[PDB]
């Protein structure tokens, strides 16, 4: 039900979450240590577990209520741990092969995003990968209205309950998005040697940075 609603609200959910899973699987070993930052109910972690049965997952979020859903999702999984922490708090030491995030980092001020990317690189192994599945701003107000129309078109085509879309729009008023190429450049500024946009559907994009390759 919850997973079905996320697909209704998020254009190209399968392409964008699937691209995050595929780029991690091509970048890290079967036995990778992975941090899911702002894991919420653990949706991105779950997609990774499906592909990587032998990976160690650490799910981190500031919300105990969201992580209770992650605890239920991963009830019988002996290779999943949960950490309660704000993005702004000290990150877990690691090292990690991958740090992943979906629809969470846009809740930080821009300066805090730039600093977070730098702090993430510090806990990555050499060659390690950072992946973000993210809500991104259009480069102009005119294109932002077109991004919004395309988002609405997906939500309508997906037969989304009107009250859930209204609730979704209200939550997005608190978001601090920026365009995908600005935050990809912030990965270069943070000292990632390669950064790329893997996949994109207007307002939603999957991008990654590599710590040495
Ligand atoms: N400053 C912050 N520090 C940590 N978690 C934060 C945060 N601001 C927002 N979050 C978390 O970010 C999540 C956004 S919803 C996305 C959840 C999950 N990654 C998914 O893909 O479905 C929520 O779980 C919320 O509690
Ligand atoms: Ca949000």
Automatic annotation (TrEMBL):
Residues 34-128 form the Methyltransferase domain. One of its GO terms (molecular function) is metal ion binding. S-adenosyl-L-methionine binds at residues 17, 61, 86-87, 104. Adenine binds at residues 61, 86-87. S-adenosyl-L-homocysteine binds at residues 17, 61, 86-87, 104. It comes from the Bacteria. Ca(2+) 3 binds at residues 106, 175. Ca(2+) 2 binds at residues 106-107, 175. Keywords: Calcium, Metal-binding, Methyltransferase, S-adenosyl-L-methionine, Transferase. Ca(2+) 1 binds at residues 106-107. One of its GO terms (biological process) is antibiotic biosynthetic process. This is SAM-dependent methyltransferase.
């Amino acid at each position: 039900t919850y997973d079905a609603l996320r697909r209704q609200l998020i254009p190209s959910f399968d392409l964008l979450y699937g691209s995050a899973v595929s780029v991690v699987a091509m970048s890290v070993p079967a036995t990778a240590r992975i941090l899911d930052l702002g894991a919420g109910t653990g949706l991105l972690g779950a997609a990774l577990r499906e592909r990587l049965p032998d990976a160690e997952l650490l799910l981190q979020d500031r919300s105990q209520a969201m992580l209770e859903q992650a605890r239920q999702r991963f009830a019988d999984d002996d290779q999943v741990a949960i950490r309660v922490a704000d993005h702004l708090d000290e990150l877990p030491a690691g090292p990690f092969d991958a740090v992943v995030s979906a629809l969470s980092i846009h809740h930080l001020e821009h300066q805090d995003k730039q600093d977070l990317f730098t702090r993430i690189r510090k806990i990555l192994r050499p060659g390690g990968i950072f992946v973000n599945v993210e809500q991104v701003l259009a480069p102009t107000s005119e294109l932002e209205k077109m991004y919004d129309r395309q988002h609405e078109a997906h939500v309508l085509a997906s037969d989304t309950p009107a009250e859930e879309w209204a609730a979704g729009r209200e939550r997005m008023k608190h978001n601090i998005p920026i365009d995908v190429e600005t935050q990809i450049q912030w990965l270069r500024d943070a000292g990632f040697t390669t950064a790329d946009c893997l996949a994109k559907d207007w307002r939603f994009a999957t991008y990654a940075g590599w710590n040495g390759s």
